[PDB]
Design a binder for this molecule. Structure first.
Ligand SMILES: Nc1ncnc2c1ncn2[C@@H]1O[C@H](COP(=O)(O)OP(=O)(O)CP(=O)(O)O)[C@@H](O)[C@H]1O
Length: 327
């Protein structure tokens, strides 16, 4: 479903006084959006290996909804939801936020019947299907769709068609000691009512102390308490939820993550670098990260028969290290 292309955004969503600003602040460290580097082990490896002038990873765009009803205006203006949540208290809360979003959808589906009711034509067929489904359920819970259906769906970008990742905000203590009444029940719920949904705990407090403390004391802190920042796992969760991923260009001058959508084929992949490449492109030279690491160098990868040469019909895969060729 969703918008076309790679210019997506994920939105920070939940009730007030639940850590939104903190959560936003920590990511940062436009005042309502920020781009955050995605952390990646591969990237680091490639970068250490080539020691390039220029290092450029992928980024997540995250929106700290400032502006409900106007609130939902901005949600429709995002491509998925970071459902933030505090730790009855968080389950009532989850049911609420789901309630609003489902109700904003029916409320918009109304006129979409009205205006369509004069059959001048095949679209009318499918909107019923949707309404029928959204007078039960969220759009996304229907894992069966088609080209005709997605077209129409994408016309209105319903709130319940956006994907969702649950973030449970916690006291320093519960994250660290790794047990919390609510996370159990939330996970119970998510399994019952949103199967597959990611639930990721974290502590805004904790994360913010870590911003303040010196990389030295910082490390002493994370050593002492046998714990980790939760952020990297959340940034990746967001990116993954947007259906984004990337490929690499590594060489002595630059290593770079190039964000793409699942299914992007090599010519559109190359067009990210320069738009003449979508047409101008005869093949892509691909090395999987695994092989480059194992074999230990490009000539080793080549010598071992693993430096594959894909044509114009190749779906780039996440992690591919690619030299694109033209003319
Ligand atoms: N796990 C936790 N530990 C300590 N303090 C916490 C906490 N979760 C939230 N808080 C506190 O709540 C206060 C307000 O948090 P924050 O501004 O991030 O929430 P919010 O953005 O939902 C308020 P608003 O609704 O005005 O945007 C902060 O000063 C923060 O210390």
């Amino acid at each position: 479903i969703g918008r076309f292309g790679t210019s997506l955004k994920i939105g920070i969503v939940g009730l007030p006084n639940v850590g939104k600003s903190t959560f936003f602040n920590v990511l940062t460290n436009d005042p309502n959006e920020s781009r955050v580097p995605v952390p990646d082990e591969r990237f680091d490896f490639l970068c250490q290996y080539h020691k390039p002038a220029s290092k450029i990873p992928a980024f997540l765009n995250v929106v700290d909804i400032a502006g409900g009803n106007a609130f939902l205006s901005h949600i429709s203006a995002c491509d998925g939801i970071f459902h933030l949540t505090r730790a009855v208290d968080p389950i009532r809360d989850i049911e609420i936020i789901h309630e609003e979003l489902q109700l904003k959808d029916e409320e918009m589906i109304g006129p979409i019947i009205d205006k369509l009711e004069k059959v001048a034509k095949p679209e009318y067929d499918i909107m019923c299907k949707v309404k029928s489904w959204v007078i039960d359920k969220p759009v996304r819970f229907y894992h069966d769709w088609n080209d005709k259906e997605i077209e129409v769906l994408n016309k209105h970008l319903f709130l319940t068609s956006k994907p969702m990742v649950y973030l449970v905000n916690l006291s320093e203590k519960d994250y660290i000691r790794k047990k919390n009444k609510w996370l159990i029940k939330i996970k119970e719920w998510v399994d019952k009512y949103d199967p597959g949904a990611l639930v990721i705990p974290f502590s805004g407090a904790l994360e913010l102390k870590l911003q303040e403390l010196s990389a030295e004391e910082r490390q002493k802190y994370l050593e002492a308490n046998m714990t980790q920042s939760a952020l990297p796992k959340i940034i990746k969760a967001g990116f993954a939820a947007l259906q984004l991923e990337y490929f690499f260009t590594a060489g002595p001058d630059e290593v770079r993550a190039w964000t793409i959508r699942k299914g992007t084929k090599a010519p559109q992949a190359a067009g990210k670098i320069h738009t003449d490449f979508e047409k101008g492109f005869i093949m892509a030279e691909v090395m999987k990260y695994e092989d480059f690491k194992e074999e230990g160098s490009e000539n080793a990868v080549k010598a071992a028969g693993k430096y594959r040469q894909q044509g114009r019909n190749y779906i780039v895969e996440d992690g591919d290290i690619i030299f694109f060729k033209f003319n």
